[PDB]
PDB file of C-alpha atoms in Angstrom:
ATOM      1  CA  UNK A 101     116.629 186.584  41.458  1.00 24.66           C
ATOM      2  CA  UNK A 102     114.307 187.716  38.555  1.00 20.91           C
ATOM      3  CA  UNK A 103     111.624 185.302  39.318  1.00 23.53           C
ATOM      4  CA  UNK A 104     108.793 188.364  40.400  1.00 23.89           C
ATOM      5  CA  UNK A 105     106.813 187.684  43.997  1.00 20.89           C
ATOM      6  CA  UNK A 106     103.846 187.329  41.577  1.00 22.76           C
ATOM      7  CA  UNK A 107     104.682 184.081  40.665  1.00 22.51           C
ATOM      8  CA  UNK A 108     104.708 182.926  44.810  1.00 23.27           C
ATOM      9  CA  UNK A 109     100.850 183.711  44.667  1.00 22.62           C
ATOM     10  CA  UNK A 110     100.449 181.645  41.099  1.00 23.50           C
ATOM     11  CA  UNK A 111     102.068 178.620  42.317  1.00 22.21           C
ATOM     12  CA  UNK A 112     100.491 178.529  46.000  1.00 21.94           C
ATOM     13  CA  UNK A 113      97.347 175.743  45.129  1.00 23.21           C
ATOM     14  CA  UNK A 114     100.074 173.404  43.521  1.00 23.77           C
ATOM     15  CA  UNK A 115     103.083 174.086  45.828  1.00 22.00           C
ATOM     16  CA  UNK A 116     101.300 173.112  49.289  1.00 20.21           C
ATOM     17  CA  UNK A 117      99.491 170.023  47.304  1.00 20.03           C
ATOM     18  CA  UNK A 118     103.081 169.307  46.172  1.00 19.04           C
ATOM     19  CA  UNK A 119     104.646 169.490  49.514  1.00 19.58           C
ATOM     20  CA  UNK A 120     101.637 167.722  51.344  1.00 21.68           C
ATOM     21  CA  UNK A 121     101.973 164.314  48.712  1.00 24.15           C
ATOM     22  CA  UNK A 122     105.770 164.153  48.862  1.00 24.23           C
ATOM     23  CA  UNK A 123     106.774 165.190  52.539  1.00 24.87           C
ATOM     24  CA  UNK A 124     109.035 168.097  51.370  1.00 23.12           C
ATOM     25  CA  UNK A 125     109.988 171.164  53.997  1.00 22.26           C
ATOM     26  CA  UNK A 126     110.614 174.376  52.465  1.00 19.69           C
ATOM     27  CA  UNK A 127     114.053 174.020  53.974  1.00 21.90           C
ATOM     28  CA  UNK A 128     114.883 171.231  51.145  1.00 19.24           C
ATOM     29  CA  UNK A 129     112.813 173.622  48.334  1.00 19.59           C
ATOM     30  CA  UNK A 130     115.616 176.385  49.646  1.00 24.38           C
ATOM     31  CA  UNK A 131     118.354 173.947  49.986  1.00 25.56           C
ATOM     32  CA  UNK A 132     118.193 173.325  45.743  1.00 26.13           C
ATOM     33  CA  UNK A 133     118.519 177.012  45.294  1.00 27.26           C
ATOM     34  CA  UNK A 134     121.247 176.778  47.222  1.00 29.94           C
ATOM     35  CA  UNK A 135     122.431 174.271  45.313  1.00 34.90           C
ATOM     36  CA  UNK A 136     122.235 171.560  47.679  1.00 35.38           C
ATOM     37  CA  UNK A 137     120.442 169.051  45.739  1.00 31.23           C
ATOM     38  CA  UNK A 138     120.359 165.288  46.675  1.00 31.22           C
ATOM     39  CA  UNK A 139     118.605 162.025  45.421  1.00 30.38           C
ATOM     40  CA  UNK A 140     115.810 162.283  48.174  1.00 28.75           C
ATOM     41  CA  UNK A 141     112.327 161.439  47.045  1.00 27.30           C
ATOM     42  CA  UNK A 142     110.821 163.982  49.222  1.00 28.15           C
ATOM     43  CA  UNK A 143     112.598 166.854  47.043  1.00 29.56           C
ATOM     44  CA  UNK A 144     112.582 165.100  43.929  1.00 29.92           C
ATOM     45  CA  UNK A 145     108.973 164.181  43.699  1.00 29.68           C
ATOM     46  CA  UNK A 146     108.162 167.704  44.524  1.00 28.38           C
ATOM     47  CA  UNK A 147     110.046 168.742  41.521  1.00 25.94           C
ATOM     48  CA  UNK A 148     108.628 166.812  39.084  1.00 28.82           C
ATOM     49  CA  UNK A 149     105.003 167.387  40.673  1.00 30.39           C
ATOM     50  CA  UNK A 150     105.401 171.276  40.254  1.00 29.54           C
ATOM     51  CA  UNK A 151     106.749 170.851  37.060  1.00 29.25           C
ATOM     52  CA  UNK A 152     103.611 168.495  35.542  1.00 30.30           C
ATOM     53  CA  UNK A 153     100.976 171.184  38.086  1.00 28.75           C
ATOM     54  CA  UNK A 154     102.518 173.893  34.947  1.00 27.51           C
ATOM     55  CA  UNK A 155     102.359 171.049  32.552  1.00 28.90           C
ATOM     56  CA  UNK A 156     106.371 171.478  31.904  1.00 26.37           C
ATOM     57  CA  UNK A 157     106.859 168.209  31.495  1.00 24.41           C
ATOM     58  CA  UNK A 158     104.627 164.833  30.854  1.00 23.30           C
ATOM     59  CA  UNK A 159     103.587 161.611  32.475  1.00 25.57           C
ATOM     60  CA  UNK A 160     107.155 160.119  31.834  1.00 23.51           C
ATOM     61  CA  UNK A 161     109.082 163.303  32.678  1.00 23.82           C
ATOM     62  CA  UNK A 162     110.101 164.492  28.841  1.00 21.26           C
ATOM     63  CA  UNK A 163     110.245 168.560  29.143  1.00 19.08           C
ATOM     64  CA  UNK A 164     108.560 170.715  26.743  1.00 19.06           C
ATOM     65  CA  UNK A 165     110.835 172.998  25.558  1.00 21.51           C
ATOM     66  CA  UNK A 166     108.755 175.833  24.292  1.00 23.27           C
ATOM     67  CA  UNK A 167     106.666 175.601  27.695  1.00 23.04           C
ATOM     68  CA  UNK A 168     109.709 175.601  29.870  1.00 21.80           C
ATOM     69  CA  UNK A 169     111.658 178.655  27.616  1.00 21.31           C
ATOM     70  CA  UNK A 170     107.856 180.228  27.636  1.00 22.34           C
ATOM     71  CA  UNK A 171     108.140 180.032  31.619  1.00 21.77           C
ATOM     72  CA  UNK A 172     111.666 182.024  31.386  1.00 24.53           C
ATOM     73  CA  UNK A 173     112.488 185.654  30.520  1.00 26.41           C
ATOM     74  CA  UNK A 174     112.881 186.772  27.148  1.00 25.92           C
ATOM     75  CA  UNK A 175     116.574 187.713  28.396  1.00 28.35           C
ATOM     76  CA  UNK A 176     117.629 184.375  29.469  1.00 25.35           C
ATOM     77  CA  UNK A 177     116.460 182.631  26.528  1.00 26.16           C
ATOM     78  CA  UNK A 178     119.165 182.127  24.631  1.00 22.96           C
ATOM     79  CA  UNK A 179     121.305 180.921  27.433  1.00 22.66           C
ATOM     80  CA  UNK A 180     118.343 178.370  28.744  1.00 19.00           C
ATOM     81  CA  UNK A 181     118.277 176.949  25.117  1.00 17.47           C
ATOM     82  CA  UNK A 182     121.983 175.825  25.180  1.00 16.39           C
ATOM     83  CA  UNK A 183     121.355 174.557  28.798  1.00 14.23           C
ATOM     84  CA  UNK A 184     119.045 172.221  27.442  1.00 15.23           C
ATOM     85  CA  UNK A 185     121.104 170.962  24.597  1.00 13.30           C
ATOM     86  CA  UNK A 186     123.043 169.816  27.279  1.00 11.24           C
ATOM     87  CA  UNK A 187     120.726 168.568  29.841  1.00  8.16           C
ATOM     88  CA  UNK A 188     117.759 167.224  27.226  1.00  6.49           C
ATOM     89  CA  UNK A 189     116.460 164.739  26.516  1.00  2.50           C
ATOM     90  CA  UNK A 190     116.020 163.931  30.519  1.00  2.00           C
ATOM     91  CA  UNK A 191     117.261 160.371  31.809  1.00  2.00           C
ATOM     92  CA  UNK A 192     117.153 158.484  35.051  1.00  5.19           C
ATOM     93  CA  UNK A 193     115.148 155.462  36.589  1.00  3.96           C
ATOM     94  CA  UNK A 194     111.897 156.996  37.071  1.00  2.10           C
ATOM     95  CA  UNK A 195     110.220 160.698  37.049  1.00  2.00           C
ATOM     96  CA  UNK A 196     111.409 161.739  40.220  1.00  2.00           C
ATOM     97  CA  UNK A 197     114.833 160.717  39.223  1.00  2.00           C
ATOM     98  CA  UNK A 198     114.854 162.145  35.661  1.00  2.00           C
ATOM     99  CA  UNK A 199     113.735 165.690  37.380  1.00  2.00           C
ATOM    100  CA  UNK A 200     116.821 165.007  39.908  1.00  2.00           C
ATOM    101  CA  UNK A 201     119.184 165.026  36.926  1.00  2.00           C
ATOM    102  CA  UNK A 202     117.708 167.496  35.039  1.00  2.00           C
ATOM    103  CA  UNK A 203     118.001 169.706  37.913  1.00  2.00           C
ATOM    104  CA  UNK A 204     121.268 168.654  38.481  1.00  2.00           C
ATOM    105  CA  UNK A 205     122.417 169.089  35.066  1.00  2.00           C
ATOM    106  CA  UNK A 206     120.855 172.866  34.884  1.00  2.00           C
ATOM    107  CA  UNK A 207     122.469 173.852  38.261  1.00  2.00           C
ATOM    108  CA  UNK A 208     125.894 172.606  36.972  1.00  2.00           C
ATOM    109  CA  UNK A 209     125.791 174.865  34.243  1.00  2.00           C
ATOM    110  CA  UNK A 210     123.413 177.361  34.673  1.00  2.00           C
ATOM    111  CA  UNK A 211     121.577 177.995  38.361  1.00  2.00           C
ATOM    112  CA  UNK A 212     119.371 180.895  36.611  1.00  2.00           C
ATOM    113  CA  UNK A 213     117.663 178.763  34.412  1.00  2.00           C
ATOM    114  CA  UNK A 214     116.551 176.197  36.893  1.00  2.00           C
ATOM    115  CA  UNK A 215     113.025 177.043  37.991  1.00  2.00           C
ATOM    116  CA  UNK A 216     111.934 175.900  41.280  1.00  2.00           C
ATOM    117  CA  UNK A 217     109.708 177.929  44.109  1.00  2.00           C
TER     118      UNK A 217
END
């Protein structure tokens, strides 16, 4: 894994508040990099509320590409880009739902790229 323990420390504030509003247990957080990833609100909604807490994506769940390939290493840009060809624009019946798909979608084809602590 390339993501750097620095990044555990950044995201601390906005991971427990995350966790706390949507009911998730780190055991779903590590289930998703595991690729175990199902339709559950409680992991979901923690997705797209980590996502918005690094403003990667908006009030209706569209990404912002630059952010999210900004977030990424210079070395896995290229393959994150045609990722999100495939998996953007994002789709589903609400934000928790959209970030389900997308996450789905990104797994599917490329785990590395799918940024989630």
């Amino acid at each position: 894994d390339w993501v750097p323990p620095e990044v555990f420390d950044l995201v601390a504030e906005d991971k427990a508040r995350c966790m706390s509003e949507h009911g998730t247990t780190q055991a779903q957080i590590d289930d998703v990099d595991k690729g175990n990833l199902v339709n559950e609100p409680s992991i979901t909604c923690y997705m797209y509320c980590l996502l918005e807490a690094f403003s990667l994506v908006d009030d209706e769940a569209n990404v912002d590409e630059d952010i999210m390939l900004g977030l990424l290493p210079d070395q896995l840009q290229e393959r994150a880009q045609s990722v999100m060809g495939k998996c953007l624009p994002t789709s589903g019946s609400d934000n928790c739902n959209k970030i389900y798909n997308l996450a789905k979608c990104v797994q599917e084809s490329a785990p590395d790229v799918w940024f989630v602590i």
